[PDB]
Amino acid sequence: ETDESVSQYCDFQYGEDCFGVLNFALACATKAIGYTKETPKNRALDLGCATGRASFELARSYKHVDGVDYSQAFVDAATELQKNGCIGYSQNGEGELKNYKVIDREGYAFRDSFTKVEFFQGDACNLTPQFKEYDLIMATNLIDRLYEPRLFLENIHKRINEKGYLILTSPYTWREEYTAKKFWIGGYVDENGKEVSTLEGLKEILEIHFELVATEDIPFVIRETSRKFQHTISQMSVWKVI
Amino acid sequence: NIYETDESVSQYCDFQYGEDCFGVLNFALACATKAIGYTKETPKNRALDLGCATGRASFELARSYKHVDGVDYSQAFVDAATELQKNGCIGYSQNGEGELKNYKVIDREGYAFRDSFTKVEFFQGDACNLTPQFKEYDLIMATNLIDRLYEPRLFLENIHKRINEKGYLILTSPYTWREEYTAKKFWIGGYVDENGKEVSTLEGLKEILEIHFELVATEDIPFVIRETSRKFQHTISQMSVWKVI
C-alpha cells in the first residue's frame, strides 16, 4: 500500500524520462534556481518533497535545503537514499508484476550536495516554527492536496525572507477526497455565478504579500503500469515577497 | 436542439472525436486504419466493432467494409453513436479545472467518415454473450476490452465461431488487469503463477487463441484520454492480430 506509492514516486523522481518529458523534479528545481538567481540562496524549503529529488537538486545551488513531506514513509525513503547511498524500489509492470530497480545516489550529479539536505515529516498547512527564514519556498503539486490550502498560502510569507520567493506548481486537480469544495482555490463556480480559475484565486490570496513574477507550464509523467501512465501539465507560478 | 451526452459518455466523445493530444493520432482512427491494413486480403463485407463506445472506430471501419456492427455494453454509448448517425451532431462536456466544464459539438459532416456512416448499425450487447445474428464477420475488433471483462476467456474461447474462414480477430489492450474488473483467477496475464513464473498476457492470449487462430502481428498503439484540462492518461496499448485456422 504505502510501499506501492513510495515505489511509484521513486520511479517518478529518479527514473528515466517518458514520452520525451524530462524529469519533473529536476525541471522544477532547475527553473526555481533560475528565478532565484539574484537571491542569497542560503536556505530553501521543499514542501511535498516525497522521495527527495527536488531537495537534492536544490542543494546544488543552496547552502541548506529542508525537505518536508506529510508521509513518514516518503521521508524514510529520502533519508535512506541520503544516508545509505542507495534504495531499492519495485517498478510496476503488467498487471501485478513488478521489476526491481536500484537508485544509486552516486550515479546522480546531486551527489556533490546531498549532505546539505535534511528531511522531515510535517504538514504544510501548519509548519512548526523552526521552518523559517527561507530565501525560497517551493511547494510542488501540493496545493490541490491540502485539506485547507489557505492555512498554508495565507501564512507562508512569514517563513520567507524579504525579496525571497514562493514557487508553486500544481495541475489544479481539486478533488473532494483531498479538499472540501468550499476550500478549493479554483475550479469552481462561485456564489455569483462566476467561474474561478485557480491562478486567479491564488492571485487574490498571494498578492497581499507577493508579486506574481512568472508562469509556465511544466509537463510530468508518472508510471502506473508498464503501459499506463499519467501525463499531466502542471502550472508553475513564481511569487516574490513584496 | 442537439443531443447532449453525460460525463462518462462525454469522456469517450472527446476521446473518439476530439482534438489530438500531445501529437498522438486519434486512437479509434489508428486502430481502424491498422485493422483495414491487416485485413487487406480479406473480403471486406462485414466487420464487428466490440466495445464501440461512441462509434468512431465503427464509422472509420465503414470506409472500407460494406457493413459494420458496433456493439457496446452501455446503452448510453450506443445512443450517442446512433444520435450522431441519425441527426449528424451530438454535444459533450469537456472537463476543465475542478468542476468547470467546456461544452463542444461533434458534427458528422466535419469528418471524412461522413461518406460511409449509413453502413453502420449500433447495438447494445455483451461480448461474452452475443446474440446468434452477430456472425459471419471477416473482422472482429475488440478494443481495450479484455482487461475490462470479468472472465475474458468466455469471449475469447468462442469468438472463432463468429468469424469467417481466413477472417481476423484484432485485440488491443494495455493489459491493465485489476481485481475491480477481473477476478485474479481469470487474468490472462500479468501475474505470477503457482510455480513462481511470470505470465505475460500475450502468452496467455496465445494459449487460448492458438487453438483456432494464428498470431500474425503485434503492434504498440499509444492513446491519450483527457481527464482534466491539465491531467491526461497516456497509455500504450498492444494490438494483436489473429487469423482463423
Short mmCIF file of C-alpha atoms in Angstrom, two decimals:
data_model
loop_
_atom_site.label_atom_id
_atom_site.label_comp_id
_atom_site.label_asym_id
_atom_site.label_seq_id
_atom_site.Cartn_x
_atom_site.Cartn_y
_atom_site.Cartn_z
CA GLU A 1 0.00 0.00 0.00
CA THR A 2 2.36 2.69 1.25
CA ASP A 3 5.21 0.78 -0.40
CA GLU A 4 3.42 0.97 -3.75
CA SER A 5 3.10 4.76 -3.54
CA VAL A 6 6.72 5.11 -2.40
CA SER A 7 7.91 2.89 -5.26
CA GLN A 8 5.82 4.94 -7.69
CA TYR A 9 7.42 8.22 -6.57
CA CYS A 10 10.88 6.63 -6.60
CA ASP A 11 10.31 5.84 -10.27
CA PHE A 12 8.81 9.28 -10.91
CA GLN A 13 11.62 11.18 -9.20
CA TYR A 14 14.66 9.04 -10.05
CA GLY A 15 13.60 7.04 -13.13
CA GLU A 16 14.06 7.62 -16.84
CA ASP A 17 12.14 10.09 -19.00
CA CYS A 18 8.93 9.02 -20.76
CA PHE A 19 7.30 10.32 -23.96
CA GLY A 20 10.06 12.90 -24.25
CA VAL A 21 9.06 14.51 -20.94
CA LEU A 22 12.04 15.40 -18.78
CA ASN A 23 12.33 14.64 -15.07
CA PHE A 24 9.82 16.84 -13.25
CA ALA A 25 11.76 17.33 -10.01
CA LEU A 26 14.90 18.31 -11.92
CA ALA A 27 12.95 20.70 -14.17
CA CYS A 28 11.21 22.41 -11.25
CA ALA A 29 14.40 22.72 -9.20
CA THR A 30 16.38 23.98 -12.19
CA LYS A 31 13.69 26.53 -13.03
CA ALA A 32 13.48 27.55 -9.36
CA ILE A 33 17.23 28.20 -9.19
CA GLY A 34 16.97 30.44 -12.26
CA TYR A 35 14.09 32.51 -10.85
CA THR A 36 16.03 32.96 -7.58
CA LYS A 37 19.50 33.67 -9.02
CA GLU A 38 19.56 37.23 -7.63
CA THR A 39 18.84 35.96 -4.09
CA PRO A 40 21.35 34.86 -1.42
CA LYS A 41 20.37 31.19 -1.93
CA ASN A 42 21.14 30.18 1.67
CA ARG A 43 18.01 28.37 2.89
CA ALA A 44 15.38 26.63 0.75
CA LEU A 45 12.29 24.65 1.75
CA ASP A 46 10.85 21.90 -0.49
CA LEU A 47 7.31 21.07 0.65
CA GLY A 48 5.87 17.87 -0.72
CA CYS A 49 9.40 16.58 -1.27
CA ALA A 50 8.17 12.97 -1.46
CA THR A 51 11.25 10.84 -2.21
CA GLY A 52 13.55 13.88 -2.10
CA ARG A 53 14.72 14.55 -5.66
CA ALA A 54 13.86 18.27 -5.74
CA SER A 55 15.58 18.82 -2.38
CA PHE A 56 18.79 17.14 -3.58
CA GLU A 57 18.76 19.25 -6.74
CA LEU A 58 18.09 22.50 -4.88
CA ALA A 59 21.04 21.68 -2.62
CA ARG A 60 23.43 22.00 -5.57
CA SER A 61 22.73 25.75 -5.52
CA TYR A 62 21.58 26.43 -1.93
CA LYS A 63 23.57 26.14 1.29
CA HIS A 64 20.75 24.36 3.15
CA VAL A 65 17.59 22.64 1.94
CA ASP A 66 14.79 21.38 4.17
CA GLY A 67 12.68 18.66 2.56
CA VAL A 68 9.25 18.21 4.13
CA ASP A 69 6.54 15.68 3.35
CA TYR A 70 3.38 14.65 5.16
CA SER A 71 4.04 10.91 4.77
CA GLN A 72 6.73 9.50 7.06
CA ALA A 73 7.18 6.67 4.54
CA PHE A 74 8.33 9.13 1.86
CA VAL A 75 10.64 10.84 4.35
CA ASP A 76 12.21 7.49 5.28
CA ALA A 77 12.89 6.65 1.63
CA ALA A 78 14.54 10.03 1.07
CA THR A 79 16.59 9.67 4.26
CA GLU A 80 17.53 6.10 3.31
CA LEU A 81 18.90 7.24 -0.06
CA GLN A 82 20.67 10.17 1.61
CA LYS A 83 22.25 8.10 4.38
CA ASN A 84 22.68 4.63 2.84
CA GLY A 85 23.56 5.94 -0.62
CA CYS A 86 21.09 3.57 -2.28
CA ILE A 87 17.48 2.48 -2.15
CA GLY A 88 15.51 -0.22 -3.94
CA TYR A 89 12.04 0.07 -5.41
CA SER A 90 9.58 -2.11 -7.33
CA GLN A 91 8.74 -0.74 -10.77
CA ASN A 92 5.22 -1.62 -11.88
CA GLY A 93 4.92 -3.85 -14.94
CA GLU A 94 2.00 -5.76 -16.50
CA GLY A 95 -0.85 -6.30 -14.01
CA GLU A 96 0.61 -7.17 -10.59
CA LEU A 97 4.11 -7.96 -11.95
CA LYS A 98 6.92 -5.79 -10.54
CA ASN A 99 10.50 -5.16 -11.73
CA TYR A 100 13.11 -4.46 -9.00
CA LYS A 101 15.20 -1.33 -9.56
CA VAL A 102 18.05 0.31 -7.62
CA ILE A 103 18.62 4.05 -7.14
CA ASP A 104 22.30 4.78 -6.54
CA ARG A 105 22.94 8.20 -5.02
CA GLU A 106 26.45 8.16 -6.51
CA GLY A 107 25.02 7.97 -10.05
CA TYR A 108 23.48 11.46 -9.98
CA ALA A 109 25.10 14.87 -10.24
CA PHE A 110 23.39 15.83 -6.98
CA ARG A 111 25.76 13.54 -5.05
CA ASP A 112 28.03 16.57 -4.54
CA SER A 113 25.49 18.28 -2.26
CA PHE A 114 23.31 15.65 -0.53
CA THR A 115 24.67 16.41 2.96
CA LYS A 116 23.17 19.92 2.72
CA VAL A 117 19.65 18.44 2.93
CA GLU A 118 17.54 17.49 5.94
CA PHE A 119 14.28 15.59 5.51
CA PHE A 120 11.35 15.98 7.92
CA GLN A 121 7.76 14.84 8.25
CA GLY A 122 5.39 17.79 8.54
CA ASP A 123 2.16 19.38 7.38
CA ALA A 124 2.47 22.41 5.10
CA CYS A 125 -0.83 23.73 6.49
CA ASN A 126 0.73 24.04 9.96
CA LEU A 127 4.52 24.04 9.88
CA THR A 128 6.42 24.06 13.16
CA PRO A 129 8.10 27.40 13.96
CA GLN A 130 11.65 26.26 13.13
CA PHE A 131 10.92 26.20 9.38
CA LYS A 132 11.52 29.88 8.67
CA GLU A 133 13.96 32.37 7.15
CA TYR A 134 13.95 30.79 3.69
CA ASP A 135 15.06 32.52 0.52
CA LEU A 136 12.96 30.06 -1.48
CA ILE A 137 9.89 28.02 -0.58
CA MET A 138 8.75 25.59 -3.27
CA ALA A 139 5.54 23.57 -2.99
CA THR A 140 5.44 21.01 -5.79
CA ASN A 141 1.99 19.68 -6.76
CA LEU A 142 0.83 20.37 -3.22
CA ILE A 143 -1.99 22.91 -3.01
CA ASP A 144 -4.59 20.63 -4.62
CA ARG A 145 -3.77 18.00 -1.99
CA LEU A 146 -4.10 20.16 1.15
CA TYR A 147 -7.17 19.84 3.36
CA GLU A 148 -7.30 23.66 3.60
CA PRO A 149 -4.75 25.37 1.33
CA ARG A 150 -5.44 28.83 2.79
CA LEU A 151 -3.83 27.68 6.04
CA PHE A 152 -0.64 27.35 4.00
CA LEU A 153 -0.97 30.12 1.41
CA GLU A 154 -2.18 32.91 3.72
CA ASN A 155 0.70 32.42 6.19
CA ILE A 156 3.67 31.18 4.12
CA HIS A 157 5.04 34.71 3.63
CA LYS A 158 6.04 34.71 7.31
CA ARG A 159 8.56 31.91 6.57
CA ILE A 160 10.21 33.67 3.59
CA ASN A 161 12.90 36.35 3.74
CA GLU A 162 12.40 39.76 2.17
CA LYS A 163 12.94 39.62 -1.60
CA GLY A 164 12.52 35.85 -1.22
CA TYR A 165 10.43 33.66 -3.49
CA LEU A 166 7.48 31.31 -3.23
CA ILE A 167 7.25 28.92 -6.18
CA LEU A 168 4.13 26.82 -6.65
CA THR A 169 3.38 24.12 -9.18
CA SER A 170 0.01 22.44 -9.50
CA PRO A 171 -2.17 20.75 -12.12
CA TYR A 172 -5.18 22.20 -10.24
CA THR A 173 -6.75 18.75 -9.80
CA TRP A 174 -9.09 19.73 -6.99
CA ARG A 175 -10.86 16.69 -5.52
CA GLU A 176 -13.17 16.23 -2.54
CA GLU A 177 -11.14 13.23 -1.35
CA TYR A 178 -8.37 15.76 -0.57
CA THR A 179 -10.07 19.15 -0.20
CA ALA A 180 -13.65 20.03 0.64
CA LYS A 181 -15.16 22.02 -2.23
CA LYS A 182 -15.61 25.16 -0.12
CA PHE A 183 -11.80 25.28 0.19
CA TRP A 184 -10.86 24.86 -3.49
CA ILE A 185 -8.75 27.82 -4.60
CA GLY A 186 -10.17 27.48 -8.10
CA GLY A 187 -12.03 25.22 -10.46
CA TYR A 188 -15.44 26.19 -9.11
CA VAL A 189 -18.42 28.42 -9.83
CA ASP A 190 -18.72 30.98 -7.04
CA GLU A 191 -21.91 32.25 -5.38
CA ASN A 192 -22.16 35.00 -8.03
CA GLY A 193 -22.17 32.56 -10.97
CA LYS A 194 -18.58 33.38 -11.97
CA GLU A 195 -16.09 30.64 -12.83
CA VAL A 196 -12.97 30.90 -10.67
CA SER A 197 -9.60 29.84 -12.04
CA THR A 198 -7.05 28.63 -9.52
CA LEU A 199 -4.43 31.14 -10.69
CA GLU A 200 -6.90 33.99 -10.14
CA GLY A 201 -7.72 32.61 -6.69
CA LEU A 202 -4.02 32.36 -5.90
CA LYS A 203 -3.59 35.97 -7.03
CA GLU A 204 -6.31 37.04 -4.59
CA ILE A 205 -4.61 35.30 -1.67
CA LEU A 206 -0.97 35.93 -2.53
CA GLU A 207 -0.91 39.47 -3.94
CA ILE A 208 -1.40 40.83 -0.43
CA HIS A 209 2.22 39.82 0.28
CA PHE A 210 3.69 38.71 -3.08
CA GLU A 211 4.02 39.82 -6.69
CA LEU A 212 3.43 37.31 -9.48
CA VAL A 213 6.69 37.27 -11.44
CA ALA A 214 6.16 34.46 -13.96
CA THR A 215 4.13 31.44 -15.00
CA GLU A 216 4.99 28.44 -17.14
CA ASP A 217 3.53 25.04 -17.89
CA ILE A 218 5.72 22.06 -16.95
CA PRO A 219 4.60 18.57 -18.04
CA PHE A 220 5.20 15.47 -15.98
CA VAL A 221 4.65 11.74 -16.46
CA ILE A 222 4.19 9.19 -13.67
CA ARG A 223 4.19 5.47 -14.43
CA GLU A 224 1.20 3.46 -13.23
CA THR A 225 1.91 0.25 -15.17
CA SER A 226 4.39 -0.64 -17.90
CA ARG A 227 1.81 0.60 -20.46
CA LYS A 228 -0.37 3.05 -18.49
CA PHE A 229 0.95 6.46 -17.44
CA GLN A 230 -0.39 9.77 -16.13
CA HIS A 231 0.66 12.67 -18.40
CA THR A 232 -0.12 16.00 -16.71
CA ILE A 233 0.76 19.67 -17.38
CA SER A 234 1.36 21.49 -14.07
CA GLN A 235 1.41 25.27 -13.92
CA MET A 236 4.39 26.79 -12.15
CA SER A 237 3.76 30.18 -10.57
CA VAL A 238 6.58 32.32 -9.18
CA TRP A 239 5.85 34.82 -6.41
CA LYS A 240 8.28 37.39 -4.99
CA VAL A 241 7.75 38.73 -1.47
CA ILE A 242 6.85 42.42 -1.51
CA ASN B 1 -31.98 21.08 -30.24
CA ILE B 2 -28.82 18.95 -30.01
CA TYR B 3 -28.47 15.70 -28.09
CA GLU B 4 -26.28 16.10 -25.00
CA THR B 5 -24.17 13.30 -23.53
CA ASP B 6 -23.38 12.79 -19.84
CA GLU B 7 -19.94 12.98 -18.21
CA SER B 8 -18.96 9.33 -18.69
CA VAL B 9 -20.10 9.32 -22.31
CA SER B 10 -18.60 12.78 -22.87
CA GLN B 11 -15.13 11.49 -21.94
CA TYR B 12 -15.33 8.96 -24.76
CA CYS B 13 -16.83 11.56 -27.12
CA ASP B 14 -13.78 13.73 -26.52
CA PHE B 15 -11.50 10.69 -26.82
CA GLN B 16 -13.00 9.46 -30.09
CA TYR B 17 -13.99 12.68 -31.90
CA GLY B 18 -11.97 15.39 -30.14
CA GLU B 19 -8.64 17.01 -30.86
CA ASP B 20 -5.38 15.07 -30.78
CA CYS B 21 -3.43 15.39 -27.53
CA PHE B 22 0.38 15.50 -27.26
CA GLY B 23 0.64 14.88 -31.00
CA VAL B 24 -0.94 11.44 -30.64
CA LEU B 25 -3.12 10.25 -33.52
CA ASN B 26 -6.76 9.52 -32.73
CA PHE B 27 -6.83 6.04 -31.21
CA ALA B 28 -10.01 4.88 -32.95
CA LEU B 29 -8.74 6.09 -36.33
CA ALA B 30 -5.37 4.39 -35.78
CA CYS B 31 -6.96 1.10 -34.74
CA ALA B 32 -9.40 1.09 -37.66
CA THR B 33 -6.69 2.05 -40.16
CA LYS B 34 -4.40 -0.72 -38.93
CA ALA B 35 -7.26 -3.22 -38.93
CA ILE B 36 -8.04 -2.28 -42.53
CA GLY B 37 -4.37 -2.79 -43.37
CA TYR B 38 -4.10 -6.18 -41.67
CA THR B 39 -7.26 -7.39 -43.46
CA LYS B 40 -6.10 -6.20 -46.91
CA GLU B 41 -6.61 -9.63 -48.48
CA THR B 42 -9.98 -10.43 -46.88
CA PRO B 43 -13.45 -9.86 -48.28
CA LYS B 44 -14.37 -6.53 -46.73
CA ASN B 45 -18.03 -7.41 -46.27
CA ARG B 46 -18.74 -7.48 -42.52
CA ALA B 47 -16.86 -6.12 -39.51
CA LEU B 48 -17.72 -6.28 -35.81
CA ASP B 49 -16.51 -3.48 -33.51
CA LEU B 50 -16.81 -4.77 -29.94
CA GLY B 51 -16.83 -2.03 -27.34
CA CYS B 52 -17.51 0.62 -29.98
CA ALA B 53 -18.28 3.25 -27.30
CA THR B 54 -19.27 6.44 -29.15
CA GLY B 55 -18.75 4.82 -32.55
CA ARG B 56 -15.64 6.40 -34.10
CA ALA B 57 -13.89 3.12 -34.94
CA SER B 58 -17.10 1.70 -36.45
CA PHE B 59 -17.53 4.75 -38.68
CA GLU B 60 -13.88 4.54 -39.74
CA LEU B 61 -14.11 0.81 -40.49
CA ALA B 62 -17.20 1.52 -42.61
CA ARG B 63 -14.98 3.39 -45.08
CA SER B 64 -13.53 0.02 -46.13
CA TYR B 65 -16.12 -2.56 -45.06
CA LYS B 66 -19.56 -2.97 -46.61
CA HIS B 67 -21.26 -3.42 -43.22
CA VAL B 68 -20.02 -2.66 -39.71
CA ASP B 69 -21.77 -3.69 -36.50
CA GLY B 70 -20.97 -1.66 -33.40
CA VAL B 71 -21.74 -3.30 -30.05
CA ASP B 72 -21.33 -1.85 -26.56
CA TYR B 73 -22.47 -2.92 -23.11
CA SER B 74 -23.61 0.60 -22.19
CA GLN B 75 -26.86 1.75 -23.80
CA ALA B 76 -25.78 5.36 -23.23
CA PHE B 77 -22.77 4.97 -25.53
CA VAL B 78 -24.95 3.21 -28.13
CA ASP B 79 -27.46 6.08 -28.07
CA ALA B 80 -24.74 8.70 -28.52
CA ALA B 81 -23.33 6.91 -31.57
CA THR B 82 -26.81 6.41 -33.04
CA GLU B 83 -27.68 10.08 -32.48
CA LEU B 84 -24.53 11.17 -34.31
CA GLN B 85 -25.52 8.79 -37.10
CA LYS B 86 -29.15 9.96 -37.38
CA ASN B 87 -29.09 13.69 -36.55
CA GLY B 88 -25.46 14.34 -37.51
CA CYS B 89 -24.49 16.08 -34.27
CA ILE B 90 -24.08 15.49 -30.55
CA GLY B 91 -22.86 17.68 -27.71
CA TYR B 92 -20.50 16.68 -24.91
CA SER B 93 -18.99 18.16 -21.75
CA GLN B 94 -15.22 18.56 -21.67
CA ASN B 95 -13.72 18.72 -18.18
CA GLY B 96 -11.54 21.58 -17.01
CA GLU B 97 -10.26 22.81 -13.66
CA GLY B 98 -12.13 21.16 -10.80
CA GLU B 99 -15.86 21.20 -11.62
CA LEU B 100 -15.58 23.65 -14.52
CA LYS B 101 -16.78 22.26 -17.84
CA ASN B 102 -16.41 23.15 -21.51
CA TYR B 103 -19.13 22.10 -23.96
CA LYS B 104 -18.39 21.03 -27.54
CA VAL B 105 -20.33 19.83 -30.57
CA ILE B 106 -19.40 16.89 -32.79
CA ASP B 107 -20.59 17.34 -36.38
CA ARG B 108 -20.66 14.21 -38.53
CA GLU B 109 -20.04 16.27 -41.67
CA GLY B 110 -16.78 17.56 -40.17
CA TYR B 111 -15.16 14.13 -40.56
CA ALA B 112 -14.16 12.09 -43.59
CA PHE B 113 -16.28 9.14 -42.46
CA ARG B 114 -19.33 11.20 -43.46
CA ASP B 115 -19.16 9.18 -46.71
CA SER B 116 -19.92 5.84 -45.02
CA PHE B 117 -21.96 6.35 -41.85
CA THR B 118 -25.08 4.70 -43.30
CA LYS B 119 -23.18 1.39 -43.46
CA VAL B 120 -23.02 1.07 -39.64
CA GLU B 121 -25.54 -0.38 -37.18
CA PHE B 122 -25.03 0.23 -33.46
CA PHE B 123 -26.35 -2.24 -30.88
CA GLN B 124 -26.30 -2.74 -27.14
CA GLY B 125 -24.75 -6.08 -26.30
CA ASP B 126 -22.21 -8.15 -24.40
CA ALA B 127 -19.11 -9.68 -25.97
CA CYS B 128 -19.35 -12.61 -23.54
CA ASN B 129 -22.87 -13.43 -24.74
CA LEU B 130 -23.51 -12.21 -28.28
CA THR B 131 -26.84 -12.99 -29.92
CA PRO B 132 -26.81 -15.51 -32.80
CA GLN B 133 -27.23 -12.92 -35.58
CA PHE B 134 -23.77 -11.41 -34.92
CA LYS B 135 -21.87 -13.90 -37.05
CA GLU B 136 -20.02 -14.32 -40.34
CA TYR B 137 -17.59 -11.46 -39.75
CA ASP B 138 -14.40 -11.03 -41.73
CA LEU B 139 -13.08 -8.85 -38.90
CA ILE B 140 -13.86 -8.74 -35.20
CA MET B 141 -12.13 -5.87 -33.40
CA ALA B 142 -12.24 -5.73 -29.59
CA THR B 143 -10.53 -2.52 -28.49
CA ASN B 144 -9.26 -2.12 -24.90
CA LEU B 145 -11.86 -4.63 -23.78
CA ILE B 146 -10.38 -7.89 -22.47
CA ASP B 147 -8.95 -6.19 -19.37
CA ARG B 148 -12.43 -4.85 -18.58
CA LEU B 149 -14.19 -8.25 -18.67
CA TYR B 150 -14.82 -10.29 -15.54
CA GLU B 151 -13.93 -13.54 -17.37
CA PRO B 152 -12.29 -12.55 -20.68
CA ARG B 153 -11.82 -16.22 -21.67
CA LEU B 154 -15.64 -16.63 -22.05
CA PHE B 155 -15.45 -14.26 -25.06
CA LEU B 156 -12.06 -15.39 -26.45
CA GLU B 157 -12.63 -19.20 -26.44
CA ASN B 158 -15.80 -18.89 -28.58
CA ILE B 159 -15.12 -15.82 -30.82
CA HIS B 160 -13.74 -18.01 -33.63
CA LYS B 161 -17.32 -19.21 -34.22
CA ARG B 162 -18.37 -15.69 -35.30
CA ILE B 163 -15.53 -15.19 -37.82
CA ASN B 164 -15.39 -16.46 -41.38
CA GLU B 165 -12.57 -18.61 -42.66
CA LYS B 166 -9.43 -16.52 -43.24
CA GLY B 167 -11.11 -13.86 -41.09
CA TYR B 168 -9.34 -11.87 -38.40
CA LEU B 169 -9.61 -11.21 -34.67
CA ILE B 170 -7.90 -7.96 -33.68
CA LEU B 171 -7.42 -7.19 -29.99
CA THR B 172 -5.93 -4.12 -28.35
CA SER B 173 -5.26 -3.89 -24.64
CA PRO B 174 -2.82 -2.19 -22.26
CA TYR B 175 -3.20 -5.26 -20.02
CA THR B 176 -4.37 -3.20 -17.03
CA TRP B 177 -5.58 -6.19 -15.06
CA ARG B 178 -7.45 -5.13 -11.92
CA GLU B 179 -9.46 -7.19 -9.43
CA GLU B 180 -12.14 -4.50 -9.61
CA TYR B 181 -12.79 -5.61 -13.20
CA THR B 182 -11.45 -9.17 -13.47
CA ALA B 183 -11.16 -11.96 -10.93
CA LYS B 184 -7.48 -12.79 -10.46
CA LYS B 185 -8.07 -16.40 -11.50
CA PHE B 186 -9.38 -15.02 -14.81
CA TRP B 187 -6.45 -12.69 -15.53
CA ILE B 188 -4.98 -13.74 -18.85
CA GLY B 189 -1.57 -12.46 -17.81
CA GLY B 190 0.25 -10.03 -15.60
CA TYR B 191 0.51 -12.40 -12.65
CA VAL B 192 2.89 -14.90 -11.07
CA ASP B 193 1.66 -18.47 -11.38
CA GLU B 194 1.77 -21.09 -8.61
CA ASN B 195 5.30 -22.08 -9.68
CA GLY B 196 6.81 -18.61 -9.39
CA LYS B 197 6.89 -17.83 -13.13
CA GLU B 198 5.63 -14.54 -14.51
CA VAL B 199 2.80 -14.87 -17.05
CA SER B 200 2.66 -12.38 -19.90
CA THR B 201 -0.77 -11.55 -21.27
CA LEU B 202 0.31 -12.12 -24.88
CA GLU B 203 1.45 -15.62 -23.92
CA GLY B 204 -1.89 -16.21 -22.22
CA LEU B 205 -3.68 -14.98 -25.33
CA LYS B 206 -1.65 -17.44 -27.40
CA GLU B 207 -2.65 -20.31 -25.12
CA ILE B 208 -6.35 -19.51 -25.53
CA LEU B 209 -6.45 -18.48 -29.19
CA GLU B 210 -3.87 -20.65 -30.95
CA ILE B 211 -6.41 -23.49 -30.78
CA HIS B 212 -8.32 -21.69 -33.56
CA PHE B 213 -6.08 -18.76 -34.59
CA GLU B 214 -2.56 -17.93 -35.75
CA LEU B 215 -0.72 -14.92 -34.34
CA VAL B 216 0.05 -12.65 -37.29
CA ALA B 217 1.32 -9.39 -35.81
CA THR B 218 1.72 -7.28 -32.70
CA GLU B 219 1.97 -3.50 -32.58
CA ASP B 220 2.09 -0.84 -29.88
CA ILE B 221 -0.54 1.90 -30.28
CA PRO B 222 -0.49 4.91 -27.93
CA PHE B 223 -3.59 6.80 -26.86
CA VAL B 224 -4.36 9.80 -24.66
CA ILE B 225 -7.60 10.25 -22.70
CA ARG B 226 -8.31 13.70 -21.25
CA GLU B 227 -9.31 13.67 -17.58
CA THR B 228 -9.00 17.42 -16.93
CA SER B 229 -7.66 20.39 -18.86
CA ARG B 230 -4.24 19.54 -17.40
CA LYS B 231 -4.43 15.83 -16.41
CA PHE B 232 -4.44 13.04 -19.01
CA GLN B 233 -3.89 9.28 -19.22
CA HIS B 234 -1.12 8.41 -21.71
CA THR B 235 -1.23 4.68 -22.37
CA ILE B 236 0.43 2.32 -24.88
CA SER B 237 -1.93 -0.45 -25.96
CA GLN B 238 -0.73 -3.59 -27.71
CA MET B 239 -2.67 -4.65 -30.79
CA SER B 240 -2.51 -8.37 -31.55
CA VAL B 241 -3.73 -9.72 -34.90
CA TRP B 242 -5.14 -13.24 -35.17
CA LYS B 243 -6.18 -15.11 -38.32
CA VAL B 244 -8.62 -18.03 -38.07
CA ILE B 245 -7.49 -21.62 -38.73
#
